[PDB]
Design a protein around this motif. Sequence first.
Motif, PDB file in Angstrom:
ATOM      1  N   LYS B  61      25.091  37.648  47.760  1.00  0.00           N
ATOM      2  CA  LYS B  61      25.127  36.506  47.350  1.00  0.00           C
ATOM      3  C   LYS B  61      25.192  36.231  45.845  1.00  0.00           C
ATOM      4  N   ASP B  62      24.632  37.352  45.074  1.00  0.00           N
ATOM      5  CA  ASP B  62      24.640  36.965  43.691  1.00  0.00           C
ATOM      6  C   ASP B  62      26.036  37.210  43.110  1.00  0.00           C
ATOM      7  N   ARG B  63      26.438  36.281  42.468  1.00  0.00           N
ATOM      8  CA  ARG B  63      27.884  36.228  41.895  1.00  0.00           C
ATOM      9  C   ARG B  63      27.708  36.738  40.393  1.00  0.00           C
ATOM     10  N   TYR B  64      29.116  37.576  40.068  1.00  0.00           N
ATOM     11  CA  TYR B  64      29.133  38.078  38.808  1.00  0.00           C
ATOM     12  C   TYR B  64      30.576  37.829  38.281  1.00  0.00           C
ATOM     13  N   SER B  65      30.745  37.872  36.913  1.00  0.00           N
ATOM     14  CA  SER B  65      32.117  37.582  36.570  1.00  0.00           C
ATOM     15  C   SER B  65      32.838  38.818  35.938  1.00  0.00           C
ATOM     16  N   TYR B  66      34.148  39.360  36.353  1.00  0.00           N
ATOM     17  CA  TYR B  66      34.658  40.378  35.713  1.00  0.00           C
ATOM     18  C   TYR B  66      36.290  39.774  35.313  1.00  0.00           C
ATOM     19  N   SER B  67      36.988  40.702  34.761  1.00  0.00           N
ATOM     20  CA  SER B  67      38.448  40.425  34.352  1.00  0.00           C
ATOM     21  C   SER B  67      39.182  41.471  34.808  1.00  0.00           C
ATOM     22  N   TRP B  68      40.461  40.800  35.205  1.00  0.00           N
ATOM     23  CA  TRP B  68      41.766  41.353  35.903  1.00  0.00           C
ATOM     24  C   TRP B  68      42.817  41.737  34.841  1.00  0.00           C
ATOM     25  N   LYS B  69      42.511  41.581  33.528  1.00  0.00           N
ATOM     26  CA  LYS B  69      43.426  41.903  32.265  1.00  0.00           C
ATOM     27  C   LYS B  69      44.066  43.108  32.824  1.00  0.00           C
ATOM     28  N   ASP B  70      45.549  42.950  32.569  1.00  0.00           N
ATOM     29  CA  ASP B  70      46.316  44.092  32.537  1.00  0.00           C
ATOM     30  C   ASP B  70      46.263  44.763  33.924  1.00  0.00           C
ATOM     31  N   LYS B  71      45.985  44.013  35.222  1.00  0.00           N
ATOM     32  CA  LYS B  71      45.776  44.306  36.651  1.00  0.00           C
ATOM     33  C   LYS B  71      44.574  45.650  36.545  1.00  0.00           C
ATOM     34  N   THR B  72      43.722  45.358  35.948  1.00  0.00           N
ATOM     35  CA  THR B  72      42.569  46.338  35.897  1.00  0.00           C
ATOM     36  C   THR B  72      41.145  45.695  35.876  1.00  0.00           C
ATOM     37  N   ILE B  73      40.346  46.038  36.876  1.00  0.00           N
ATOM     38  CA  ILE B  73      39.075  45.258  36.983  1.00  0.00           C
ATOM     39  C   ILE B  73      38.046  45.810  35.907  1.00  0.00           C
ATOM     40  N   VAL B  74      37.811  44.851  35.106  1.00  0.00           N
ATOM     41  CA  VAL B  74      36.715  45.124  33.911  1.00  0.00           C
ATOM     42  C   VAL B  74      35.505  44.391  34.340  1.00  0.00           C
ATOM     43  N   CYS B  75      34.520  44.876  34.431  1.00  0.00           N
ATOM     44  CA  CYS B  75      32.948  44.389  34.673  1.00  0.00           C
ATOM     45  C   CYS B  75      32.398  43.922  33.342  1.00  0.00           C
ATOM     46  N   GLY B  76      32.058  42.818  33.137  1.00  0.00           N
ATOM     47  CA  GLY B  76      31.444  42.520  31.713  1.00  0.00           C
ATOM     48  C   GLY B  76      30.020  41.788  31.855  1.00  0.00           C
TER      49      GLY B  76
END
Lengths: 121, 121
Positions: B61-76
Amino acid sequence: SLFELGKMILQETGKNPAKSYGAYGCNCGVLGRGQPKDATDRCCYVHKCCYKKLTGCDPKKDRYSYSWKDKTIVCGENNPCLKELCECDKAVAICLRENLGTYNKKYRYHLKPFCKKADPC
Amino acid sequence: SLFELGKMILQETGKNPAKSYGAYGCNCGVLGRGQPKDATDRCCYVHKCCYKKLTGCDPKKDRYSYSWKDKTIVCGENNPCLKELCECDKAVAICLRENLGTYNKKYRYHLKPFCKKADPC
């Protein structure tokens, strides 16, 4: 078809297609073309111009085959029109991702009746 | 949450997450762990052990945010548990993609088959 396109957009941009590109600017969406308002919108302009050159297939209804190999869209149709169609969709997905740097939400549902005429393709 | 996970999977493998990994082998799905059937299976075995280490946050249930920049998953995520959570999901999405070469639909199921007791995490 819209299903393939929509999936390509998500894979490339990482954003919900309908949400961020369903009606963006003067060219992304259902209201025909219009003077592009920025880079993202310009992609949709080129995309609609790409669609106008297709002979024998429908971008709305017609589905086609493609794979996502090593995070790359790879079209795989024997049908020339369907292949070209797949290439039109691949090109706009990549373009949209390349211009995420200047994507403006204030354009998400921009009122097309405010757009200027677009140059002919 | 399940939201980011499925998205990550679709982005890395390009496959429908529910259809291809919601019931695969002894670890991919919602029926606990078991003796891995193959590499894809092993990816999921590790993913579940990854969750067990989390302390505090709810993986489903806990939502987090991440990036897909340059088709790579970056957790931030500034939140520790949530960050550790995002890395677990990214890890399984990448592992599933890397092992598509040996993916065998023969391991899908509607009712989980027999699975030897997966060793402790």
